[PDB]
C-alpha cells in the first residue's frame, strides 16, 4: 500500500452512466472531470457531460445523475471549460444547479436548471484556434471565460434567455499566456500568467482591477536561491498563509538536468507584495525531457493545514507549504499501475479527492 495514507473509495457506488463511461472508455480516450467544491462531479466523456451529486449517502432517493448533450466542436470537450452554479451557493438537488459549458473556439451553452436537460440557451465569444481556456463559476450566477492569451470575459445569463458578456477591466488579453485562474471567497478572481498575477474584485455584474504583480521580477531570485534558469508558473491556489503558486524551474546545463517543482507562498495584503516569500522545494523532481511535457497541477483541500497535493496523470505527491509545522508526511502516491490514471482531483468537505481511471472517486486520508 502507501506508507502514511489510506487511499480508498470516497462516497457511495457511482451512477450507472458514470460506470458505463469508465468501463467502456479505452486508454486512447481522454476523459476529464470537474470535481466541484459544492459536492457535484462533472465527467466530460466523448460528446456528453455526465453530472452527478457526489453521493456521501448511499440512499437512492437522494441520487442525482443527469446527462447533458454538449455543443458540437472539432476539438475535445474539456471539464476545465465546464462549470456549475448553485442558487445562493447552496447545493440542494437538481433545481438549485445551473450549468455552463464552453468550447475552445468560444461556443457557449447554458442550462438554467440541470433538472431541465433539453432546456438551454446558447451564445458565442471568440478565440484563436489552439486556445486552452477555463470556465469558472463566479458570484451573481455568472461565469468568467478565460483565454490562453488571458482575455477574460464575464458571462451573465439574463432572465430573457440572453447571455450578456463583457471583457474584464485591463483583461483584453493582449508574454500574457495564461496558466491558471482562481476564484476566491467574497469576490476575488485571480489570473496567473507566464509573467504575472492579476487580481479583480467582483460584484454580481462588474469587476474592478485590483493589481498586476510582476512575480517573475519578485520571486525569481527566491526560487533560484532555494534550489541552486528557466522558471514556469503553473498553478495558483490559496490557503491561510495566502496565495500558493506552483512553479517549475530548471537549468539546461545541469550535468543531470532535473525539473524542480516548488511551492511558493506569498501574502495577498492590499495591492502590493510583502518582503516575506517562502519557497518550498518538493520531492517531485523528474528528469527534464521537454517543456511541453512539464505538466503538474495543484490541489489544496484544507485551507489551514499547510498541505498541498501535486498531481500529474500517474501520481500524486503529498507536499508541504509554508513553515511545514502542521504539514502531513511528504509522500508520493502512485496511480500509474495497470492502465490506471489520475483523471482529475479536487476536494469534498476539505478531504483530498482523486478521480482515478481504475477505482473512481478516492480520498487520501492520513493514517
Amino acid at each position: 500500500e502507501t506508507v502514511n495514507y489510506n487511499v480508498q473509495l470516497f462516497g457511495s457506488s457511482l451512477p450507472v452512466k458514470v460506470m458505463e463511461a469508465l468501463s467502456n472508455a479505452s486508454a486512447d480516450e481522454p476523459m476529464a472531470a470537474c470535481i466541484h467544491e459544492g459536492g457535484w462531479a462533472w465527467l466530460a466523456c466523448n460528446d456528453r457531460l455526465i453530472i452527478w451529486k457526489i453521493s456521501h449517502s448511499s440512499s437512492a432517493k437522494l441520487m442525482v445523475c443527469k446527462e447533458l448533450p454538449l455543443p458540437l466542436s472539432d476539438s475535445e470537450w474539456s471539464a476545465d471549460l465546464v462549470d456549475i452554479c448553485a442558487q445562493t451557493g447552496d447545493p440542494a438537488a437538481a433545481q438549485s444547479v445551473a450549468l455552463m459549458a464552453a468550447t475552445p473556439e468560444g461556443s457557449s451553452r447554458y442550462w438554467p436548471n440541470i433538472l431541465h436537460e433539453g432546456t438551454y440557451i446558447e451564445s458565442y465569444t471568440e478565440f484563436g484556434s489552439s486556445l486552452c481556456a477555463f470556465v469558472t463559476a463566479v458570484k451573481g450566477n455568472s461565469f468568467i471565460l478565460s483565454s490562453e492569451k488571458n482575455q477574460l470575459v464575464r458571462l451573465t445569463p439574463d432572465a430573457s434567455g440572453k447571455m450578456n458578456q463583457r471583457v474584464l477591466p485591463q483583461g483584453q488579453g493582449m508574454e500574457s499566456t495564461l496558466c491558471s485562474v482562481l476564484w476566491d471567497k467574497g469576490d476575488c478572481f485571480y489570473t496567473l500568467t507566464d509573467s504575472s498575477i492579476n487580481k479583480w474584485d467582483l460584484d454580481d455584474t462588474s469587476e474592478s482591477q485590483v493589481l498586476n504583480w510582476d512575480m517573475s521580477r519578485v520571486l525569481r531570485e527566491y526560487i533560484s536561491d532555494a534550489i541552486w534558469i528557466n522558471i514556469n508558473y503553473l498553478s495558483l491556489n490559496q490557503n491561510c498563509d495566502g496565495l500558493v503558486i506552483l512553479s517549475a524551474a530548471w537549468h539546461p546545463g545541469d550535468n543531470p538536468c532535473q525539473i524542480y517543482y516548488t511551492l511558493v507562498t506569498v501574502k495577498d495584503e492590499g495591492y502590493n507584495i510583502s518582503d516575506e516569500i517562502t519557497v518550498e522545494v518538493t520531492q517531485f523532481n523528474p528528469v527534464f525531457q521537454a517543456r511541453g511535457m512539464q505538466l503538474c497541477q495543484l490541489v489544496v483541500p484544507n485551507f489551514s493545514s499547510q498541505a498541498c497535493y501535486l498531481y500529474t496523470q500517474e501520481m500524486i505527491f503529498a507536499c508541504s507549504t509554508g513553515t511545514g509545522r502542521s504539514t502531513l508526511p511528504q509522500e508520493k502516491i502512485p496511480f500509474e499501475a495497470q492502465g490506471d490514471n489520475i483523471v482529475g482531483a479536487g476536494s469534498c468537505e476539505g478531504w483530498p479527492v482523486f478521480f482515478i481511471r481504475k477505482s473512481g472517486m478516492l480520498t487520501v486520508v492520513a493514517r
Binding site: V210, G270, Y271
Partner: protein
Amino acid sequence: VNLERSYMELIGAERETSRRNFRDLSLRPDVNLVIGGPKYADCAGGYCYSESSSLLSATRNRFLHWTSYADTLELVEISLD
C-alpha cells in the same frame, strides 16, 4: 569634423563605501494613500547649468541628475572638477 561615430560606456564607479550620505528629506503633502494606484516604471533625468561651459564660471562642469521610483526622488549634484 572628427565624426565621433561610436561611444563606450565608462562606469563612473561609485566606490565610496559612503553611500553619498543621502540627505533623506520626507515631504508630507496633505494627500491620502491610493491603494492599487498605477505602478509607474522607474525613471531618471538630468540638468546642466548656464555658463557650465565657461572656464571662469562658478557652474563650470557642474550638473544635476536624479532617479525617481515610486514615491522617492534621489537628486545629485556632480562636479567633475
